[PDB]
């Protein structure tokens, strides 16, 4: 039996552990955190994620989708909140087949952990990877107390997140050609209780957005009608706009309250613990990190956030990480050797990870920001109606299809250009020749 050591019992790590273990691999998974399945008296906060077709299909292949979806809230559309007007619901797709799912992170990780162990993987918690000796094929782990433990490894999988220790170790033996692109927005998690969401009639079966240009809030629902709210706001005010809102200007919870009362007036009343949440939850950082290579020969490979940290604005980090786990397990299972598997996995996945990193950066303006855009969208709907197998909105290709991200982006670019061009020098839909635009759709977009 082939042997593998996985670092990080997160989403990609636990999924790949299950897929490999059920194929008879000897799997050892090391996780720095404690086992979340060991119930304690601690009050841990609820992070929600938007699971879409790529992640759901990865779970489906692993036989875990039904279990995960049983604990997920259906989000049928995007509810845009602009003060003064009732919330506007933009359905995400054609029917209830085209939805996204709000899942609690902890519930998903419990299901994945159980799944990896049921398949035969051994999971070792409270052990963080500190260093790797590639030459000797040994690694060093430590607990929170700092006691070190050395292990031999045959194949190392870095599923250890955005700040991957495996990536750091690899960067000492190979040039990973890393390029870090900082992101000016920090984030803060806030909570809406079930009583508050019910009192203010906040729709449970939707993803909620409070656009505000350079900053915004999003809220995802929980099974108990509570919502996790994420505030995205610049860490610092830029030199050109020193008065522009930023986390630096929000000195405490009281300042956060005044900011929400002025900028998000219909949201502030739903945030009962705003002051406490603001002061006790730390401000998180966002980034895009791109690598030229994801592996060291046949010895080690990265996947998920360890390979390609991305900005959160497309809700695709988990979806991409789970899609990577399937691809990795498939390549490892069938290749001539690990070196061939890792090179083929990297060659397949890197262009797609680059595409979603670019599309996620682009999606910020689509959420938080129009006269020319409405005519483009109006023309886009007719083209999608006339040609639904050809003209598929980019959000739908990324969210509801398994088309390689690079292809979703390429078709998205053709569509965006087509619309931008077609509307240029036209006041309305009457002056636009619909059959001419449709001919360009048939000429440039093959049916899928
Ligand atoms: C609050 C929040 C909300 C998000 N919402 C969405 C969403 O709506 N949709 C979406 O698709 N994505 C979302 N994402 C992104 C998504 O969570 C990640 O892209 C995804 O978890 C990446 O999976 P992963 O397995 O690569 O890493 P992770 O799931 O982060 O797992 C990494 C694991 O490695 C462990 N680890 C780290 N360092 C070490 C070490 N040295 N030794 C041992 N173990 C280690 C960690 O403790 C963790 O268990 C969100 C992210 C956050 C933080
Ligand atoms: C660090 C951290 C915080 C919180 C998040 C998640 C909750 O943020 C998002 C999830 C999401 O799912 N789908 C979308 C796009 C929805 C749309 O265009 O209508 C989306 C956007 C964001 Cl910011 N991710 N990481």
From Swiss-Prot:
It is an enzyme of class 1 (oxidoreductase). One of its GO terms (molecular function) is FAD binding. Belongs to the aromatic-ring hydroxylase family. KMO subfamily. Its EC number is 1.14.13.9. FAD binds at residues 11-12, 31-33, 50, 105, 129, 305, 318-319. It catalyses: L-kynurenine + NADPH + O2 + H(+) = 3-hydroxy-L-kynurenine + NADP(+) + H2O. Its cofactor is FAD. Keywords: FAD, Flavoprotein, Monooxygenase, NADP, Oxidoreductase, Pyridine nucleotide biosynthesis. The lineage of its organism: Bacteria, Pseudomonadati, Pseudomonadota, Gammaproteobacteria, Pseudomonadales. The keyword Flavoprotein applies. L-kynurenine binds at residues 78, 92, 363, 395. Changing residue 395 to A: Abolishes kynurenine 3-monooxygenase activity. Pfam families: FAD_binding_3. Pathway: Cofactor biosynthesis; NAD(+) biosynthesis; quinolinate from L-kynurenine: step 1/3; Siderophore biosynthesis; quinolobactin biosynthesis. Catalyzes the hydroxylation of L-kynurenine (L-Kyn) to form 3-hydroxy-L-kynurenine (L-3OHKyn). Probably required for the synthesis of quinolinic acid and the siderophore quinolobactin. This is Kynurenine 3-monooxygenase. Optimum pH is 8.5. HAMAP family: Kynurenine_monooxygenase (MF_01971). InterPro entries: FAD-bd, FAD/NAD-bd_sf, Kynurenine_monooxygenase. GO terms for biological process: anthranilate metabolic process; kynurenine metabolic process; L-tryptophan catabolic process; NAD biosynthetic process; NAD metabolic process; quinolinate biosynthetic process.
């Amino acid at each position: 039996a082939r042997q593998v050591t996985i670092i990080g019992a997160g989403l990609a790590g636990t999924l790949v552990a299950r897929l490999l273990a059920r194929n008879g691999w000897q799997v050892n998974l090391f996780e720095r955190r404690p086992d979340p399945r060991i119930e304690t008296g601690a009050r841990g906060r609820s992070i929600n994620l938007a699971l879409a077709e790529r992640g759901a299909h990865a779970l489906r292949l692993a036989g875990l989708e039904r279990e995960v979806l049983a604990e997920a809230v259906m989000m049928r559309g995007r509810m845009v909140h602009v003060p003064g007007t009732p919330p506007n619901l933009q359905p995400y797709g054609r029917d209830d087949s085209e939805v996204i799912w709000s899942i609690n992170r902890d519930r998903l990780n419990r299901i994945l952990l159980d799944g990896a162990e049921a398949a035969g993987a051994s999971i070792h918690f409270n052990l963080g990877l500190d260093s790797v000796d590639f030459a000797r094929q040994r690694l060093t782990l430590s607990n929170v107390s700092g006691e070190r433990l050395e292990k031999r490894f045959h194949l190392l999988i870095g599923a250890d997140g955005c700040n991957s220790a495996v990536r750091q170790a690899m960067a000492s033996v190979v040039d990973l050609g890393e390029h870090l692109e900082t992101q000016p927005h920090g984030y803060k998690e806030l909570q809406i209780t079930p009583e508050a969401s019910a009192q203010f009639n906040l729709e449970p079966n939707a993803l909620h957005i409070w656009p505000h240009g350079d900053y915004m809030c999003i809220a995802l629902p929980n099974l108990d009608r509570s919502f996790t709210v994420t505030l995205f706001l610049h860490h610092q005010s830029p030199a050109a706009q020193p008065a522009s809102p930023s986390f630096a200007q929000l000195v405490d919870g009281h300042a956060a309250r005044r900011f929400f009362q002025r900028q998000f007036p219909d949201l502030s009343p739903m945030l009962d613990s705003l002051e406490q949440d603001f002061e006790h939850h730390p401000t998180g950082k966002l980034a895009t990190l791109r690598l030229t290579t994801w592996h060291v020969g046949g010895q080690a490979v990265l996947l998920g956030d360890a390979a390609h940290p991305m900005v959160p604005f497309h809700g695709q980090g988990m979806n991409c990480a789970l899609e990577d786990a399937v691809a990795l397990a498939e390549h490892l299972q069938s290749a001539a050797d690990n070196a061939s598997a890792l090179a083929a996995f990297t060659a397949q996945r890197q262009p797609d990870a680059l595409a979603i990193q670019a599309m996620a950066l682009e999606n910020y303006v689509e959420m938080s920001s129009s006269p020319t855009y409405l005519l483009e969208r109006e023309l886009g709907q007719i083209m999608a109606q006339r040609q639904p197998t050809r003209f598929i909105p980019r959000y739908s290709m990324v969210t509801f299809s398994r088309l390689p991200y690079a292809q979703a982006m390429a078709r998205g670019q053709i569509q965006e250009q087509l619309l931008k061009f077609a509307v240029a020098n036209h006041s309305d839909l009457t002056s636009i020749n619909l059959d001419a635009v449709e001919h360009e759709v048939t000429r440039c977009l093959p049916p899928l």
